[PDB]
Fold Peptidyl-prolyl cis-trans isomerase E.
Amino acid sequence: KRVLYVGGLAEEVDDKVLHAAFIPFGDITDIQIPLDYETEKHRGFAFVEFELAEDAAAAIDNMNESELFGRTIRVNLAK
RNA sequence: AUCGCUUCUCGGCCUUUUGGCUAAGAUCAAGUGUAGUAUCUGUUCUUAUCAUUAAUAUCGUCCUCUACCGAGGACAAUAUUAA
């Protein structure tokens, strides 16, 4: 319950932006962003893994439907 | 009384049906064996079909485009809560 799906990411968003946006909720152990090597850009989503499930939970509550780089993002348990 | 439907009864067609001939064309009794096949009689096991819900989000195959890779679409159940 530590891994979150994060969608609706603008092109300018990268692993650094994600780390900065989610670290306020707790320490993070991993951030994965699937890439399209033909374009070299991400596909609009990523997975953020928190150290603690309780922190992942607080992040879902405060970040789902929040704004990042001008647009609304979607956040929920990945699985 | 008339029209339509249904049940029952009955008449008509029913050669639609017996498609040649001769010396009725001729003739006229029975088990011997086996194995093999078929039928019947019992000996044995018949009563029923089996297995939570609500809400939210999203590896394999097929098609298309671009240069094995990437993107998009569709299909195949998954997760959480509560008795």
Observations:
- The domain at 1-79 of chain A is CATH 3.30.70.330 (Alpha-Beta Plaits).
- The two ends of chain A are 8 Å apart (CA to CA).
- The beta strands of chain A are 3-7, 28-32, 35-36, 41-42, 45-50, 67-68, 71-72, 74-77.
